[PDB]
Design a protein around this ligand. Sequence first.
Ligand SMILES: COc1cc(/C=C/C(=O)O)ccc1O
Length: 283
Amino acid sequence: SFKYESAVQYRPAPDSYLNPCPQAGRIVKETYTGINGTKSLNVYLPYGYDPNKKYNIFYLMHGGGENENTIFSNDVKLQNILDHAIMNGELEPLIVVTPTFNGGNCTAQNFYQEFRQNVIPFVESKYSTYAESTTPQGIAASRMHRGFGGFAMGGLTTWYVMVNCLDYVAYFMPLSGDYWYGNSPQDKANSIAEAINRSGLSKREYFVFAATGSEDIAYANMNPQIEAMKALPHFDYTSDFSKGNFYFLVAPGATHWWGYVRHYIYDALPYFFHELEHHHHHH
Ligand SMILES: COc1cc(/C=C/C(=O)O)ccc1O
């Protein structure tokens, strides 16, 4: 059913999507040991999950003061939105992982290292993504079907993941957080451009769908960064990812709160993972 729009507008999921869906994906609490010690995450598997099929995977980071359980807690209930959207055909089934930047030496800034070395191999060796194996080569070869996003400090995590993990991840969803690398917006954009240059990727091989609220403090620093990025040849601004690769959704009146941010995921996540996808779809 999904069709790309060129300037998608903010629309909250219906209130009914916040209540439990009978077609509920399974949420599995996992514990693993990596460079930052023994840590946990949650894995959302779509309803009907079949390990002999291959699923898109989206990693989603919490904000400051939160943890790996926040996004699927009663304070957010993202799984209800996912369940309803997948059941209604709005969102193709995918795996959603909620890790944490807490623990050991880990920070929102440096999480990408643990992500690369420990999180991807742990999750993707257990569950069925497009990664045929979880060697660096197997992960890189499946990058078009892997995404990363996050809220606030988790948005910062997302930007650091982008600049350090373009080889492994093609889709990025920074929510209400800017990239802290640089003394000006131009420095931030230039850093991203340099990462893209180093990666060798074409503009059809990475995608950024940023979002925030018009009354969300993150707008103050996101907006200048987005404008600087728009000026780069590396980005073609439009939400139609069949045509371009960069969009910034600003929700009128929304404030810095998961109550709103969950809806940004509802609006944006359906836009991910169709470019170079393996099914024959018309979007
Ligand atoms: C990474 O960018 C941002 C982070 C925050 C974090 C707020 C908090 O932890 O309370 C707020 C605005 C931002 O633009």
